[PDB]
Every structure is written in C-alpha cells, then in structure tokens.
Amino acid sequence: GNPVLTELITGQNATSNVLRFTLENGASRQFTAQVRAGPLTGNCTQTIQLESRVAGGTYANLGTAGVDSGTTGDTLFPDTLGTVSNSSGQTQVYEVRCVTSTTGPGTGAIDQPVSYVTG
C-alpha cells in the first residue's frame, strides 16, 4: 500500500523536498508538478523540471520540463509530468524531486495552493 506523496513548490528558483518510495521490479510510477507565479514584475521565463534517481545515485531529468515566458502583469503557469520505472530485477528505493528556475529580470509571487509536486 504505497501512499501518494505530495510536496510544495516554494519558489521560482528552488528545489523541492524529496519524494522517496519503493518500486517493485516491472512497476512504474507517474509524477506531476506545476507552479503558478505572478503577476510578473518584468520579463520572466519559468522552468519546472522533475528529477529522479535510484537512492544514492545521481539525479537526472525525469520527463520534459515545463517552460513558460511572459512579461509585466502576466502569470506564468507551467506544468510537467514524468514516470519512474524499475526493470532492475528487484525492488528498489527511488527518489524524486522538483527543481524550478527562471531567466529574466522579473519575478512573480507563488500561488501556493496550486504549486506542488505529487504522485
């Protein structure tokens, strides 16, 4: 009975808490994430990227990152999806986190109730 895991995305340039879970051989698990920032004070491009690894490994990109650009007064709202898979021959523990980053001079306040990663 593996539970659903949920963590907040707390910033435009931030790394989420780690979502840690066992996964059986031949199983897969899907994670989604989204972050809402605005209104922007200026030009801003927000990227949201899930990362995953086997425990103690090296984090690597999981799924294609969501990206969104806008200017003063806009609200960015990218989202992303990615699925961890185990075909190693045995049960293993995996770790997933969510990294957000921006380019541009502008910033936007996080709409916290809808900015999170879950799966």
Residues that bind a copy of itself (CB under 8 A): 1-4, 6-8, 20-22, 54-57, 88, 90-94, 110, 112-116, 118
Cα-only R_g, the chain: 15
Smallest gap from Cβ 54 to a copy of itself, in A, equals 4
* SS3 (DSSP) at 55: coil
Taking the least distance from each CB to a copy of itself, the nearer of 72 and 93 is 93
Q: Pick the closer one to a copy of itself by CB: 75 or 92.
A: 92
Q: How far apart are CA 70 and CA 43, in angstroms?
A: 6
Closer to a copy of itself by Cβ: residue 99 or 110: 110
What single letter denotes the amino acid at residue 58? T
Q: Decide whether 8 or 67 has the Cβ nearer to a copy of itself.
A: 8
In the complex, the smallest distance separating the C-beta of residue 92 from a copy of itself, rounded to whole angstroms, is 4
What's phi and psi for 114, nearest 5 deg?
A: -120, 10
Tokens encoding 17: 């808490």
Query: Residue 106: enclosing H or E segment and its boundaries?
Result: none
